[PDB]
Structures are given as C-alpha cells and as structure tokens.
C-alpha cells in the first residue's frame, strides 16, 4: 500500500518538473526524504542519474531497464536493495557511483557486484576495522574502476586498494585526522596517476607515496609534512607534473626539487616557509607556483630563471622587497601580490605583455604610477584596485583598462 | 453513477489549475487513468490540447461545442465512442489526432470521417494478418493529412500511403528495428518537405529520398548508416536544409558533402566520425554544427570560414586544444565544449558577443580566463562550469557574472 | 416549476456575463444545451442575436416581443414554436435567420409566413431519396429577403433554388467535396452580385458565369483548379472586381487574365504558380493581393508597374530579395512575407513609413536595416519581427520602438 500511495503521490509530471542537473553535468533526480522509489521514476527514460537521499529499505524493480541513459547513482544514507535483472542491467550499464554511509547498513553490498564501474566516491564514516571489509575487497570485480574517492577515516589502506592497483587512475582520501598506515598497499600502485591524500594525518611524506612510479598528481593537503627530503627518487616520477602541497606546515624547500624536470603545477601556499629559496627558482620548467598567504620575507634574485612561470601567487605574504628580476619574466599571466608588505610598485612592468591578473588590494601604496597603463593584457575587472586609488589615475590610464 | 460522479468531482477551478502548456505553446489538459471523461473538462473554453490517456470505453459528449479552442485530440489507449453532433463538430474543428493503441481494434472507426484533420500520429503496430494497412485503408477518406507519424513496426511501407502521399508533407516512420523495403515508392509522394526515418535499421540510404525533390528536413536517425557515400547525389535535392544524420554508425564523411551548400543544420552527433574533411567545411550556410559524442580528435581551422555557425556542440570528443580560428566566427551562440579534453580555453572568446551559454564542466580546463567575462549576454545559467573553475575568475569579473545571474 | 428553476438558474446578470459579440459586431448570447428557454433572456432588451443551439422543447412566449434589437435568430437544431402575437412581432423586427437542421426533423414551419426579413441561412443535406429538393419549396412568400447562404452538400443544383433566387443579392454555395451541376442554368440568376462557390471541386468554370453583369465577387476557393483555360471567356464580363481562385493547384496563370482592368483583389494564395508573368501586372490597381504559400522564385518586373495596391502576400515561396519592383510601389501597407528564403531587406523599405504590418515568421534576414529606424510610425506591436532579429536595432531605436508602443 505504501508503494501504491507513493505512485499516486508522485505522478510522472511531478518527477519531470523535479528534474535538474548535478555536479557532474548529468540529468539527476534528487529524490530526498521519501519512503521508497516511485514506479513513475522509470517512465523518465532520459534520466542519467538518481540522487537518493535518506530513502531506506528501497527495493529497485527490473523496470530500471527502461533507464537506458542511466550511468550514475548517488546514494545518500540509503539502505537500498535491488532485483536480479535490475542488478544485471546496472552491471551492464552503470559507470559512476557515489555512496555515503552514515550507518554501515546504508552502504549496500550489492553495489560491488557491477563490473562496468569507472568512478566511485566512497564518502561516509568507515569503521577502523577496514581489512575486515570483504565488501571493499570486491572492487577487484570492477574491471574499469579509475576514480576512487573515499571520504572516510581510512587509517590502514585496504587490500581492496591493492586489488585495483592497475586500473585505478584517481585515488582520493579524506582521512579526517587519522594517520594513514600500512604503506605496502600504496607501494603496490602500479598505474595510478592521481594520488589525492587530503588530510591523511601524514607527519611527513610516506615512503609509500614515494614508492609510486607512475604518479602524475600528488596532493598532500592538510597533511603536516615536516620536510621534502627523499626527492633523490622523484626523478623516477618523470610523468609527474602536478605537486599539490599547500595548506601545510612546510618551512623550507631544499635544492632536491631539481630532480623533477617535468614539474608544472607546484602548490606551497599557506605554509610555514619564512624565506623563499633561490634553488627553488633554479628550476625553470615550473609554470604554476602557488605561495599565497605564506611567511616569505623576500624573493632572491634567482627567480629570473623562472621564465616559463605563468602563475606566481605571492599575495598576502610578508614580502617587503620585490626584486626586479621577477619583472624580467614576461610569461607571468596570473600574478597576485595583494595584501603584501610592499611599499612601491616597480615602474618596469610593461614588458609583461601577457598579464591578465594583477591584485594589489590591501597593500600600502603611496601613488599609483602611470606605468600601470603600460600593461597590455591588464583589464579593469582584472586589476582589482580600490575605488579611492581608482580615482588616483589619469583619465586616459583609466580608459586604458576600463574600455575593454 | 460513476460517470455522473466523475462529472461532479472534477470541478472547474481544479481543472483551471490542472491546465498546462505544451511545446507548441497551447493550453493543455492530461486526463490519465479516469473511469470516464468529466463534463467539466468539456465545459472549458480556453483548452487547446486535451490528452486522453488510458480512458476505458468512454463516449464523447456533444458538449465539445464549448471546446472551441480545442484543436489537438490526443488518444492514448482510449477506445472512444462518439456522438453524432460531436462527430460533426470534430469533423469541422479537430485538426490533429494522435492515436496510440495496443490492438488494431482499439483505433476508433470514426477517425476516417474527420475532414479537418491534418496531423495524424499512428503509433502502434498497424501490421497484422489481414489487418495490415486494411484498417487504415480508410485514410483515403482523409484529404488534408500532411503529417503522418507511424511508430508501428512496419515491415514494408503501405500502399495506402503511396496513394495518400500526393498531399502528405511529413512522413515520420519508426519501426523500432524493422527495415523498410522502400522500393522507390515515394516518387508518387511528391509534396514532402520533411522525412524522419527514425530507428528503421535501414543500414543504407534508399533512393526514394533521392527521387524526391521537395524535401528540406531529412532525418535518418538510428538507421545504422555505416556508409553515407550516396550524398553526392544530394545536390539534386536543391532545397534540403537539415541533414540529421545522427545516432548512426557513420565513421567518416565523404568530401561530396562540400557540394551540399544548402545545409543549415548538420546533426552528426552520436556517430563514429573521427576526422572532419575540410570539404565539409566549405559549406558557408551551416548554422548548427553538432558533432558531439564522436571520435573527433582535432578541429580544423577552416571553422573560422563558417561565419553563420551559431551552436557548435562538440561535447564528449577528443579535442585537446581549440584553434584561435574557432573564435574567428563571431556568431557562436552556444559553444558546447563539455566533457572534452580541452586543456585551456584561449582568451579570444572575449571577442565573441552572441555567446549565451558555454559548457566547460567536465573538461581538463586548468583555469577560466578573464576574457570569458567579456561576453555580454553570458550569465551563470549560461556559463555552466565547476565551482572551483568559476572561482578562478576575478571577484570583480565574478561579480559581473554573478550580477548577470542577478540582473 | 421547470421554467421557474431555469429562470432562477439563468439570472439577468448571468446572461450579461455570457453576452459576447459575433463577427458582425452584434450582441450574441450563446444558449446551448438547455432543457427550456429562459424568460430573463427575453427580458434583456439589449440582445440583438438570439442564439438557440441544440435546445429542445422550445416554445417561445410573447415575451420575445420584449426584445428590441432582435434581427438575428441563430436557431440551431431547434424546433421553434411561436404564438401568433410573437409571430407578428417577428413579422416586423426579425431580419436574419440561420437554420441548422437534420433533414425535415429540425426545420421550422413558421418561417414561410415571415415576409419582412432580409437575410437567411441554411445548412443540412437536402438531396434525399424521393425528396429531391422538395423540402425548400415554401420560401416563395419571402419578398424582402436579400441574402441567402447555403451549405447543403448539393449533388445537383436545385431547380427550386433557381426559381427562388430572383430577389437575391448575395448567394454562397458550399458543397464540401461534391460536384455542382450548374448546366448553364445560372443565366436566369441575373441579379447576383456575389457568387461564392466554396469547395465545389468544379475543375472547370461553368459557362453560365460569363452571362451575369452584376457579379463583383467571384469565389472558387478549394475547387482543385489546375489549368484555368476559361478566363478567356471571362473577357465578356465587365463587372468582376475580384477573382478568388485560392487554395487550388493552378500551375500557371495565363496571359489573357491581364486584360481584366476592373479586377481589384487577387486571392490566389496556396496555389501551384511557379512564375507569375510581368504582363499579368499590367493591371496596376490591384489593391488587395493574396499570393502566399506558392512557388514564386523571384518577384517579377511589372510589380514596378503596380501603384494602386495595399498588400502583397509573398509568404512561403522562393523569393530572395525585396527588389526595386516592389520598391516602385508607394501604397503598400501590409507585407505577408513570412517563413521565406528572403535574404535581405534593401534600403527603400525604410521609406515605407505607412507600414501597418510585416510578416517574418522564419525568414532568412541578416539584420533589420537602420532605414527601418527612419520610421517611428511602425511600432513593436504594429510589426511582427522575430525577437533575435528585433534586438539588432540600435538601443535608441529599440527604446523609441518601445516608447511608441506605449505612445
């Protein structure tokens, strides 16, 4: 009777007007605060995803076979059961899953039975008994799993992660204040390319992270790293171009970063670095260097080597003196020096032909020079300056960036 | 008692709040799973399209004289009996009838007496033993029929439509997986302006479309077209403007499509095409170049020649870098670049003005350039993108775009 | 008691709510499906067109003498019973009377004693077996009758109609897909000034039309005429001011039709005309013109000869431009040029300040020229322009257009 009342309650017109898009650009039905699924869901055959939020003890019929466009499920606190032919259809059709488990039962054991899975988002609250999860160790059934985002307290890395060593390409953990141990599993990653260990309570770089051989993007955000020292073997990560190490407590960058000549994306913002090294600037390949909100005192004049740098965010730092060597590099497109400790702005800025971003908000300045009109790619919306200093500009200089 | 009670419960005001609008901007009323049909529905005067779905064995009252704006009778699995004055009224007023049935006896026999009917949608199997097009042999009585949709699993096209197609102007045949033996029988059917052969599993383009001359919108959706080499003869069709060769197995485009200068919308999406020949890029009249969900790895620069292009949808392709010449065409209104492998979007998009909705979510886009805010008509609903990608724009430029969302 | 309940149900205020107006701008009151006639509806002296559609058991009391403006009685499927005083009142106020009937069953009998009415309409099949036009034999006492319109699917021309029509001015015959055998019997019909033959499916012009020198309007709509080779015999007439050969399949209009100078209104839309000759436009006072839905590939030369016109209908053909030929006309007020392949509007259309309407429902214009900003007389509600096409005008011009819409 509950299902009969629900079917009458939720006409197909109501579900059609409920239709919207998700964060993955798919047609998603956000079914929230319900007793079960209506049978009029499957009349919308153009659907590509369902968001089931807090809909427990749900039995999916075989009529899901009408959802030919379906390729994603998002189960939020739902203890859902499925039927055999529906299980086969979603085994032969589904690609993306995202299950949140506030309670253990809300994580279903049926969802690992598929094999066409590519992307998985295992958000929730996992118990510390991680190796006992045979439901986890069923990810070996998935023969195409490439994205694995576990937003849970992953103390010890599962052997489920071992069983998906090759086919995985994106690996994401939000450990939320728990130390990440049992490093041999992350040693067993062979073809993993993106390692996203966000807040794994790593007191330094794990030897497992460094035993990776095919990594391309490493993120150790909110991990209290003490040093970057083992870098004599980062040369084997020639495939690596993205180093994400911001919101951390690193205080220095040694010369060892010269080992990777393919590094492009470098993140060191919100760190404990008090003086930027020159041997960091010795590398010239680096195109993205993020150091916002740091404690940097000054920039050594070796930054002129960094010609390919298209992003040097030194904003909101302690930097009082900016050398003229940085203005020699003309490829710097996104430059933010807002809320810094500077006194005057360098007149020689016109050589930066490709310069879209300039941010100087909060920093103390005496008089804006006319040479701010010398920038070619600068825009008034791109040049974030206060209205009072907007007044302190010549009218032609105003129109130089104001008129498109 | 039940019919009288249904007349009683379905009050006028609840029908007024039940009124909706269709894709054709006509007032609408969907009657789904009722014992009969309410007389207060028939008391309405502003209603234009009434939708009779799953109505078991009802009779149409003559109170349809009140339904003057009624023009589209939608019959879904409804065995309808008819009163004679209402029959005359529908003969002189009703102009569009859609009939879906599960049994060939479910179709009303008074539909042939209709004379003002032009649009017919016979969805459901007309092909049966001794009822194969003999039931609809009464559409010879229909005179002004111009749209004849047939989702009916037809093994061979009827001789009755060969008799009728002198006045027919659209022939949408959906067999859901049954091949037509056309036998060049459309030569007597000379007045078609649109032909929509969808899900017919033809596996090749028949020569009946080639014998015709008046077609301007040709759709061959899901016909399993592996090769489309015949299109060289399509220059004979001097009036075609929309060659919807989508949802097929097309793996390449022959260069003779360059002879088709009259194309305005070329819907090749969900095909297996991996390279665009430059000869296809000769046609200056292309406006809707949808090549989405295909195997294209690069976009030729000659796209800058296509100045009339408005909506370039290359969604879910292998295009890594957009050439600057893509922004040479200033008429791009909807650049659907989503789900691609675009590494970075060049700043030349700031020159575009007609851009109203650009799709970049699901790409390899590192950051959103500032010049993307230079487009006036672009708004947040138009600029669909990941939130962190939105955050890369300057907060003053982000304020401009958030204001375009607001203002 | 039944009449009391009906009187209470339909109060005077309720009738004022239902008071509408017809195409003749007369006060109409649509009374449909009532068990009895009301008395308050006869109390209202404002009523001019008393409508009685499918109202059974009708017995009109002398309170119909209370009606002042009663000149129309639309009694449809109504058996009317009228007393002698009310009949005598009808004999001095009633002027027009429409009958809808199912053969002899719903034909009133008091209409023959009416000798002072001036208009009358009839509708309903009359050619029954053993009763070939025998039920309309009592219309001889009507002397002041002036207008008679018939839609009665006549298989043959009634001899009683030919005898009756001596005192007739306007006569329209509708056969709805039936042969009309005039057989040169309209030579007696000398007094006819408008002859309408709607859907007579003649395929030949009867030779009796060429004998009447009072006809100013000749209407042959939906006659399925393909080759008009009888207009050469129309040269004898010198009264036809407007021919109506529209909704036909006339492949070409011959040369000799350019000898009719008295023609002032050409309704030839939805035809098969491929090229309209310039010699045909030697008649330059073609005030009204209907040529839509045709196959004209260009607007020909002697439209420049035309000077005494007010509209041209060029909707749905293959004309690409407004040439100087349409630009030598200085009195056009409405342009019906929609859903065309019209490439551009040249400059001189921006001198056409007296431009009531334009129709552009899908035309291929690049942009509206700034010369259209030269005319503030054309307002946004006045012209019909696509929203994307309308927005290309300058912001001052668009603001002036919205202002003149308010002003």
* DSSP track, B98-157: EEE-SSTTSS-TTSTT-SS--EEEEES----TTTTTTGGGGGGS--S--EEEEES--SS-
Vertex C96 angle, CA C95 and C99, to 5°: 140
**A332 in Cβ contact with A356 (< 8 Å):** no
Residues 6+ apart with CB under 8 A from A89: A62, A64, A65
Say what the resolution is, in angstroms: 4.0
Whether residue B338 and residue A379 make contact (CB cut-off 8 A), yes or no, is no
**B320 in Cβ contact with B343 (< 8 Å):** yes
Cβ neighbour number for residue C235 with a 10 Å cutoff: 12
Closest CA to A108 of A186, A56, A42, A51: A56
- List the single residue in B362, B394, B400 with the smallest CB-CB distance to A25: B362
CA C360 to chain centre: 24
CB-facing half-sphere around the CA of B276: CA atoms within 13 A: 26
Pairing of strands C217-219, C194-198: parallel
CB-based contact, B359 to chain A, within 8 Å: yes
State the smallest CA–CA distance between residue B253 and chain A in angstroms.
27
What is the rounded distance in angstroms from the CA atom of residue A218 to the CA atom of residue A198?
10
Residue B57 within any structural domain of the chain: yes
| Burial of B251 per CB tally in 10 Å (0-12, 13-18, 19+) | middle
Phi, psi angle pair for A124, to nearest 5°:
155, -150
**C149 in Cβ contact with C170 (< 8 Å):** yes
Which of C:17-46 have CB within 8 Å of B? Answer: 32-33
Query: Please, which experimental method was used?
Result: cryo-EM
Residue B263 within any structural domain of the chain: no
**A370 in Cβ contact with A401 (< 8 Å):** no
Mutation to test the B interface, candidates A15, A379, A401, A404, most B Cβ within 10 Å: A379
Boundary (domain end) residue, out of C82, C117, C152: C117
What are the angstrom distances between the C-alpha of B341 and each of A59, B372, B373?
A: 38, 18, 22
Q: Please tell me which chains touch B, using 3 or more CB pairs under 8 Å as the contact test.
A: A, C
State the smallest CA–CA distance between residue A129 and chain B in angstroms.
34
Vertex C384 angle, CA C380 and C389, to 5°: 85
Whether residue B394 and residue A382 make contact (CB cut-off 8 A), yes or no, is yes
Whether residue A356 and residue B386 make contact (CB cut-off 8 A), yes or no, is no
Q: Which residue has the tokens 């576990």?
A: A150
Closest CA to B392 of B337, B344, B355: B344
Domains of chain A with bracketed CATH = 46-402 (3.80.10.10)
Q: Please tell me which chains touch C, using 3 or more CB pairs under 8 Å as the contact test.
A: B
**A318 in Cβ contact with A295 (< 8 Å):** yes
**B212 in Cβ contact with B238 (< 8 Å):** no
CATH number at residue B69: 3.80.10
Whether residue C33 and residue B62 make contact (CB cut-off 8 A), yes or no, is yes
Closest CA to A359 of A314, A393, A319, A402: A314
Cβ neighbour number for residue C313 with a 10 Å cutoff: 25
Q: According to the 3-state scheme, what is the secondary structure of chain A?
A: CHHHHHHHHCCHHHHHHHCEECCCCCEEEEEECCCCCCCCCCCCCCCCEEEEECCCCEEECHHHHHCCCCCEEEEECCCEEECHHHHHHHHHHCCEEEEEECCHHHCCCHHHHCCCCCEEECCECCCCCCCCCCCHHHHHCCCCCCEEEECCCCCECCHHHHHCCCCCCEEEEECCCCCCECCHHHHCCCCCCEEEEECCCCCCCCHHHHCCCCCCEEECCCCCCCCCCCHHHHHHCCCCCEEECCCCCCCCCCHHHHHCCCCCEEECCCCCCCCCCHHHHHCCCCCEEECCCCCCCECCHHHHHCCCCCEEECCCCCCCECCCCHHHCCCCCEEECCCCCCCCCCCCCCCCCCCCEEECCCCCCCCCCHHHHHCCCCCCCCEECCHHHHHCCCHHHHHHHHCC
Which of B:277-336 have CB within 8 Å of A? Answer: none
CA A155 to chain centre: 21
What is the rounded distance in angstroms from the CA atom of residue A80 to the CA atom of residue A52?
9
State the smallest CA–CA distance between residue B239 and chain C in angstroms.
10
**C228 in Cβ contact with C249 (< 8 Å):** no
Kindly state the tokens that stand for C107. Answer: 């034909």
What is the rounded distance in angstroms from the CA atom of residue B144 to the CA atom of residue B169?
10
**A133 in Cβ contact with A158 (< 8 Å):** yes
Phi, psi angle pair for B123, to nearest 5°:
-100, 120
> 3-state DSSP call for residue B359?
strand
Kindly state the tokens that stand for B139. Answer: 């559409």
Helix (H) or strand (E) holding B50: strand B49-53
CB-based contact, C53 to chain B, within 8 Å: yes
Kindly state the tokens that stand for C264. Answer: 């002032």
Residue C349 within any structural domain of the chain: yes
Vertex A143 angle, CA A139 and A148, to 5°: 50
Which of B:69-88 have CB within 8 Å of C? Answer: 85
CB-based contact, C324 to chain B, within 8 Å: no
Could you say which DSSP state residue B165 is in? T
Phi, psi angle pair for B324, to nearest 5°:
-60, -30
**C242 in Cβ contact with C264 (< 8 Å):** yes
Residue C240 within any structural domain of the chain: no
Vertex C240 angle, CA C236 and C242, to 5°: 140
Phi, psi angle pair for C44, to nearest 5°:
-70, 115
**A40 in Cβ contact with A15 (< 8 Å):** yes
What is the rounded distance in angstroms from the CA atom of residue C64 to the CA atom of residue C135?
28
Closest CA to B85 of B61, B59, B69, B104: B61
Whether residue B66 and residue C176 make contact (CB cut-off 8 A), yes or no, is no
Could you say which DSSP state residue B12 is in? H
Cα dihedral across residues A381, A385, A386, A388: positive or negative:
negative
Q: Which residue has the tokens 């395929």?
A: C203
What are the angstrom distances between the C-alpha of C46 and each of C15, C31, C43, C66, C389?
A: 11, 16, 9, 10, 47
Q: Are chains B and C in touch, 3+ Cβ pairs below 8 Å? A: yes
**A242 in Cβ contact with A221 (< 8 Å):** no
Give the domain extent around B54. 1-117
What is the rounded distance in angstroms from the CA atom of residue B235 to the CA atom of residue B240?
9
Residues 6+ apart with CB under 8 A from B377: B353, B354, B355, B356
Residues 6+ apart with CB under 8 A from A109: A135, A138
Residue C129 within any structural domain of the chain: no
Chain B residue closest to C176 (CA)? B115
Cβ neighbour number for residue C57 with a 10 Å cutoff: 12
Whether residue C54 and residue B62 make contact (CB cut-off 8 A), yes or no, is yes
**C244 in Cβ contact with C217 (< 8 Å):** yes
Q: Is B54 left (phi over 0), alpha (psi -120 to 50) or beta?
A: left
Closest CA to A291 of A262, A329, A264, A318: A318
Cβ neighbour number for residue C309 with a 10 Å cutoff: 22
Cα dihedral across residues C177, C178, C184, C189: positive or negative:
negative
Closest CA to A6 of A30, A33, A26, A36: A36
Cα dihedral across residues B282, B283, B288, B291: positive or negative:
negative
Cβ neighbour number for residue C386 with a 10 Å cutoff: 14
What's the domain count of chain C? 2
CB-based contact, B374 to chain A, within 8 Å: yes
What are the angstrom distances between the C-alpha of A201 and each of A159, A174, A211, A271?
A: 20, 10, 19, 16
**B346 in Cβ contact with B327 (< 8 Å):** yes
Closest CA to A357 of B377, B347, B376: B347
Q: Which residue has the tokens 């460094």?
A: A210
Residues 6+ apart with CB under 8 A from B298: B275, B319, B320
Residues 6+ apart with CB under 8 A from A245: A218, A219, A220, A221, A225, A228, A266, A267, A268, A271
Cβ neighbour number for residue B153 with a 10 Å cutoff: 16
Q: Are chains C and A in touch, 3+ Cβ pairs below 8 Å? A: no
Chain A residue closest to B359 (CA)? A25
CB-facing half-sphere around the CA of A109: CA atoms within 13 A: 5
Residue C94 within any structural domain of the chain: yes
Cβ neighbour number for residue C356 with a 10 Å cutoff: 14
State the smallest CA–CA distance between residue A183 and chain B in angstroms.
30
User: How long a stretch of residues is chain C?
Assistant: 407
Whether residue A381 and residue B397 make contact (CB cut-off 8 A), yes or no, is yes
Q: Which residue has the tokens 């310069």?
A: A355
State the smallest CA–CA distance between residue C107 and chain B in angstroms.
16
What are the angstrom distances between the C-alpha of A349 and each of A311, A335, A352, A397, B190?
A: 16, 12, 6, 15, 71
CATH number at residue C398: 3.80.10.10
- List the single residue in B30, B369, B373 with the smallest CB-CB distance to A381: B373
What is the rounded distance in angstroms from the CA atom of residue B116 to the CA atom of residue B91?
6
Phi, psi angle pair for B174, to nearest 5°:
-115, 110
> 3-state DSSP call for residue B73?
strand
Chain B residue closest to A12 (CA)? B32
- List the single residue in B338, B369, B386 with the smallest CB-CB distance to A356: B369
Could you say which DSSP state residue B69 is in? S
Which of B:110-129 have CB within 8 Å of A? Answer: none
Cβ neighbour number for residue C227 with a 10 Å cutoff: 12
What is the rounded distance in angstroms from the CA atom of residue B222 to the CA atom of residue B50?
31
Residue C206 within any structural domain of the chain: no
Helix (H) or strand (E) holding C401: helix C395-406
Closest CA to A284 of A264, A254, A313: A264
**A192 in Cβ contact with A168 (< 8 Å):** yes
Whether residue A382 and residue B338 make contact (CB cut-off 8 A), yes or no, is no
CB-based contact, C201 to chain B, within 8 Å: no
What is the rounded distance in angstroms from the CA atom of residue B315 to the CA atom of residue B296?
10
Residue B216 within any structural domain of the chain: no
Helix (H) or strand (E) holding C85: helix C84-93
What are the angstrom distances between the C-alpha of C294 and each of C223, C234, C280, C290, C313?
A: 17, 24, 16, 10, 10
> 3-state DSSP call for residue B387?
helix
Closest CA to B270 of B306, B309, B296: B296
Boundary (domain end) residue, out of C117, C142, C157: C117
For B278-308, the DSSP string reads: TTGGG-TT--EEE--SS------GGGGT-TT
Kindly state the tokens that stand for C253. Answer: 């209009």
Boundary (domain end) residue, out of C99, C117, C135: C117
| Burial of B324 per CB tally in 10 Å (0-12, 13-18, 19+) | middle
């Amino acid at each position: 009777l509950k299902q009969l009342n629900l079917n009458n309650e939720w006409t197909p017109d109501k579900l059609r007007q409920k239709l919207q898009t998700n964060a993955h650009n798919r047609l998603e039905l956000p079914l929230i605060m319900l007793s079960g699924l209506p049978d009029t869901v499957f009349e919308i055959t153009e659907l590509q995803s369902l968001k089931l939020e807090i809909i427990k003890n749900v039995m999916i019929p075989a009529t899901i076979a009408q959802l030919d466009n379906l390729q994603e499920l998002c189960l939020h606190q739902c203890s859902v059961k499925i039927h055999s032919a529906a299980l086969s259809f979603l085994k032969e059709n589904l690609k993306v899953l995202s299950v949140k488990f506030d309670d253990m039962r809300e994580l279903p054991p049926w969802m690992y039975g598929l094999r066409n899975l590519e992307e998985l988002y295992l958000v929730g609250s996992l118990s510390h008994d991680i190796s006992k999860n045979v439901t986890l160790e069923s990810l070996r059934d998935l023969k195409s799993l490439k994205i694995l985002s576990i937003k849970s307290n992953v103390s010890k890395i599962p052997q489920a992660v071992v069983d998906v060593s090759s086919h995985l390409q994106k690996m994401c953990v939000h450990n939320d204040g728990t130390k990440l141990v049992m490093l041999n599993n992350l040693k067993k990653m062979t073809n993993l390319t993106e390692l996203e260990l966000v807040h794994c309570d790593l007191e330094r770089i794990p030897h497992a992270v460094f035993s990776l051989l095919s990594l391309q993007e490493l993120d150790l955000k909110e991990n209290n790293l003490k040093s970057i020292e083992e870098i004599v073997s980062f040369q084997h990560l020639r495939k690596l171009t993205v180093l994400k190490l911001w919101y951390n407590s690193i205080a220095y960058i040694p010369e060892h970063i010269k080992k990777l000549t393919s590094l492009e994306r470098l993140f060191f913002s919100h760190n404990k670095v008090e003086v930027l090294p020159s041997h960091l600037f010795l590398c010239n390949k680096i195109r993205y260097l993020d150091l916002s909100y740091n404690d940097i005192r000054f920039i050594p004049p070796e930054i002129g080597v960094l010609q390919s740098l298209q992003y040097f965010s030194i904003t909101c730092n302690k930097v009082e003196s900016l050398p003229d060597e940085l203005y020699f590099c003309k490829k710097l497109k996104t430059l933010k020096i807002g809320k810094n400790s500077l006194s005057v702005l360098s007149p020689k800025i016109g050589n930066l032909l490709f310069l879209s971003y300039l941010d100087i908000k909060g920093n103390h300045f005496e008089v804006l020079p006319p040479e701010l009109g010398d920038c070619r790619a600068l825009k008034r919306a791109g040049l974030v300056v206060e209205d009072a200093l907007f007044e302190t500009l010549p009218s032609d200089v105003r129109e130089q960036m104001k008129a498109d | 008692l039940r019919q009288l009670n249904l007349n009683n419960e379905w009050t006028l005001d609840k029908l007024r709040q039940r009124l909706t609008k269709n894709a054709q901007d006509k007032l609408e009323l969907h009657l789904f799973m009722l014992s009969g049909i309410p007389d207060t529905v028939f008391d309405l005067v502003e209603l234009e399209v009434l939708k009779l779905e799953l109505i078991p064995d009802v009779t149409i009252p003559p109170s349809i004289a009140q339904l003057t704006g009624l023009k589209e009778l939608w019959l879904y699995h409804t065995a309808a009996k008819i009163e004679a004055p209402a029959l005359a009224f529908l003969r002189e007023n009703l102009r569009a009838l859609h009939i879906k049935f599960t049994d060939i006896k479910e179709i009303p026999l008074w539909i042939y007496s209709l004379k003002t009917l032009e649009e017919l949608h016979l969805t459901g199997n007309l092909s049966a033993e001794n009822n194969r097009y003999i039931v609809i042999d009464g559409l010879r009585e229909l005179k002004r029929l111009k749209v004849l949709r047939l989702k009916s699993n037809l093994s061979k096209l009827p001789q009755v439509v060969t008799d009728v197609g002198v006045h027919l102007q659209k022939l949408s045949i959906n067999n859901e997986g049954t091949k037509l033996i056309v036998l060049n029988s459309l030569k007597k059917m000379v007045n078609l302006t649109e032909l929509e052969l969808i899900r017919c599993d033809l596996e090749r383009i028949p020569h009946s479309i080639f014998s015709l001359h008046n077609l301007q919108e040709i759709d061959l959706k899901d016909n399993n077209l592996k090769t489309i080499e015949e299109i060289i003869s399509f220059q004979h069709l001097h009036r075609l403007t929309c060659l919807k060769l989508w949802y097929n197995h097309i793996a390449y485009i022959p260069i003779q499509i360059g002879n088709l200068t009259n194309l305005e919308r070329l819907y090749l999406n969900r095909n297996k095409i991996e390279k665009i020949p430059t000869q296809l890029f000769y046609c200056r009249k292309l406006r809707y170049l949808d090549l989405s969900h295909n195997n294209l790895t690069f976009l030729p620069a000659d796209i800058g020649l296509l100045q009339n292009l408005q909506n370039l949808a290359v969604t879910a392709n292998r295009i890594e870098a957009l050439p600057p010449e893509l922004f040479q065409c200033r008429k791009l209104r909807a650049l659907h670049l989503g789900n691609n492998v675009l590494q970075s979007l060049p700043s030349r998009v700031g020159e575009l003005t007609n851009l109203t909705q650009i799709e970049l979510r699901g790409n390899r886009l590192e950051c959103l350039p500032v010049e993307l805010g230079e487009c006036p008509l672009l708004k947040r609903s138009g600029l669909v993108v990941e939130e962190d990608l939105f955050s890369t724009l300057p907060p003053e430029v982000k304020e401009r775009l958030w204001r375009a969302d607001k203002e």
